[PDB]
Amino acid sequence: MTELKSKFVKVYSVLKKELLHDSAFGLTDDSRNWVERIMDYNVPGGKLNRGLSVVDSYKLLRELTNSKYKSELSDDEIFLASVLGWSVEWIQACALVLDDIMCWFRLPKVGMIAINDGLILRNHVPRILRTHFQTEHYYLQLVDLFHEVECQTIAGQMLDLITTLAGEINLSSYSLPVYQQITLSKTSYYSFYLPVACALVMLGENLESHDDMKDILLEMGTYFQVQDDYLDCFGDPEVIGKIGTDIEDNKCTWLVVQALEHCNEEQKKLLYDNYGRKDPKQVAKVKELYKTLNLEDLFTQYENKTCKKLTKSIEALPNVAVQAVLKSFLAKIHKRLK
Amino acid sequence: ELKSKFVKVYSVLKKELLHDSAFGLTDDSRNWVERIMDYNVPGGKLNRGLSVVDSYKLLRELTLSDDEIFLASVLGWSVEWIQACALVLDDIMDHSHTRRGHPCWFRLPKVGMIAINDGLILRNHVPRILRTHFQTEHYYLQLVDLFHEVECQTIAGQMLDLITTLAGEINLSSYSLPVYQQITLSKTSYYSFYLPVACALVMLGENLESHDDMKDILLEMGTYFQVQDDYLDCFGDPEVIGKIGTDIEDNKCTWLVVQALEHCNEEQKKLLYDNYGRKDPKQVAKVKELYKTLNLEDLFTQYENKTCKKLTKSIEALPNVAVQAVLKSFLAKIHKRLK
């Protein structure tokens, strides 16, 4: 089960050798190994669905719009899309650098190591894009698109940092607006906007002519994160392949915030005294408070209403290839159990 | 005088950014963006941005169009935008206090989100400024590289500083010298000292990859500049500085606090835990008195004399006499300064 995905995976190794044995940025033999270890720990491995969606999207935009000379994707076409797909995976790798880190005094030294790891990787994307796109017309537009998503990611990463730290001293810091900003800037941009926007820039398109699609993808990114959060609570761990830890891990879950908005005083103090522990006695009291607040129903309500909104906004787009791409994104997420 | 010729450049750029066809904005959003813009970028001495133009002027002399000054000033004002973004988060602990100056925490992420999003707005101006005014030059890509380097180095430092300032409220042992050095270097040294000279240099038609030694000097000189800052906030003629030192009350990660924790023993360590990040002058004085007892006034004289001599030596070892002149100018205006 790999096909063009196997053809995609190889590109990481090509970019990695380029980045390491680059004359413009020399490296000690010890520097190279140190950088390569950071690269391999952080960037390859995983589902790769974000980077691949760049290639899958570029393939669907070409298949439908065309007006190019042939509809089959060139080997050089597949490769360049994969280079952007892997740039996406680098952006992603940087965004997650901090997600462990979690007593307190050991935290800034620990955090310092992680920050420098991402510093190394962040300085890779400009070089990747320059090596492989410096000559195209759209190069400057591509640098913009990446600068925007890169900068929005860093903002979301900083808020998630402030927020996950402030959550250890007071759960009331987790709020609905803050959750939406973290989800939007830290995740939605690279996850849903960035792939397709990459396919469009190399397809020879201007992004300022797709603001209606950019709002759709960003909202679809929020919807996707509300899904993950919900699944981490209850969703057949044998289907997901993972045990839910968000309630234990003291995460800023869509569930937790919707809880503290609807539940009051007595229910609120129940949550402070039971959220984020490791024995199931408190984990179940939480899961029961969510059931008491009907949060499975509030979620399923949110799901159908948001799906209707986006399908409407999608059916209302002028670009049939774009909407065909967004329709595949939305149906691949809808009511997914995994 | 040339300062007045430099300041209007801000208004030039501010007018460009707002009434950009490529970036439409409501009249009501434009006021909001302008309020963010001028609250954060102009005002203050503007010395970093000015050092770009003075540096270009000294480099050119030792090897002048009005438009030249404009472009140099455009880069100097670019520096001020970077400086602005680095500092957006610095009073995040005192603006979350919607009380007096008491613990908060729940109101902290809302406060931070505002700040983060302000700096996000200002961070998107530098690429537009550099493109508008340099898209066409030989060195344009060298400029985009240079600003991406410092921009990213700045971003790392504030992220570490954030982690550090938060973890410093709970458990004081979080403040350490390696963490202090990293923050000082990545958050500050890059934009303040490297970036100005590097701007004057790349526009002067130079490649930065052949100035690694000058860069190492400038970054270290930036760290030296911050250790001076920290030391003065404790004892440095509060009447001369024109400001009252607030660092001990504010529970800041000072070079001094770090050096104290290194030298002091468990009794002195507890004196520091039980005082320090408090308000009353009685507890603040126990610290400033503990600093004296640990000999941190002389330890500072050692760092300064050694860093000054060490850098003077490294600078004189540069082949480029024009570069040596600029770094010597920076070093001698920082040296033993009382304000």
Side-chain angles (χ1 to χ4, degrees), chain B residues 265-309:
Chain B
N265 60 1
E266 282 66 60
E267 181 179 349
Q268 292 157 332
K269 194 184 298 171
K270 272 302 165 184
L271 199 159
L272 213 53
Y273 277 77
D274 289 333
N275 298 279
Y276 199 53
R278 275 73 219 182
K279 197 88 215 13
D280 83 326
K282 284 199 167 182
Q283 288 174 112
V284 158
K286 288 180 180 174
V287 166
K288 189 174 159 176
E289 190 57 20
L290 179 61
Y291 286 182
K292 289 174 167 302
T293 298
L294 278 42
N295 192 23
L296 296 188
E297 321 188 64
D298 184 60
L299 184 64
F300 173 76
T301 303
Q302 306 179 17
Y303 174 81
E304 186 172 49
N305 287 337
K306 174 186 302 269
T307 306
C308 175
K309 194 166 177 88

Side-chain angles (χ1 to χ4, degrees), chain A residues 105 108-109 112 115 119 122 126 130 134 140 144 147 150 152 154-155 158-159 162 165 169 172-173 181, chain B residues 105-106 109 116 120 131 135 141 145 148 151-153 155-156 158-160 162 166 171 174 176 182:
Chain A
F105 67 107
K109 293 211 176 180
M112 172 168 51
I115 288 163
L119 200 46
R122 202 167 280 296
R130 187 155 308 171
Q134 170 170 43
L140 272 204
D144 294 352
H147 187 266
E150 210 184 63
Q152 203 82 36
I154 288 160
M158 273 183 195
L159 185 67
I162 299 183
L165 293 192
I169 315 160
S172 50
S173 35
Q181 191 64 33
Chain B
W105 292 99
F106 61 113
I116 288 162
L120 209 183
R131 186 152 308 174
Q135 162 57 6
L141 260 57
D145 289 347
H148 182 264
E151 206 184 62
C152 279
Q153 200 83 37
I155 288 159
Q158 41 180 6
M159 223 173 276
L160 181 67
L162 216 44
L166 295 191
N171 209 327
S174 314
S176 56
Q182 188 58 31

Side-chain angles (χ1 to χ4, degrees), chain B residues 3 26 34 47 77 102 116 158 163 172 180 220 225 227 255 261 265 305:
Chain B
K3 144 158 219 53
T26 319
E34 190 182 32
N47 35 16
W77 273 108
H102 274 75
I116 288 162
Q158 41 180 6
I163 302 182
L172 191 70
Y180 172 78
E220 200 164 271
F225 187 84
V227 183
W255 183 83
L261 290 163
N265 60 1
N305 287 337

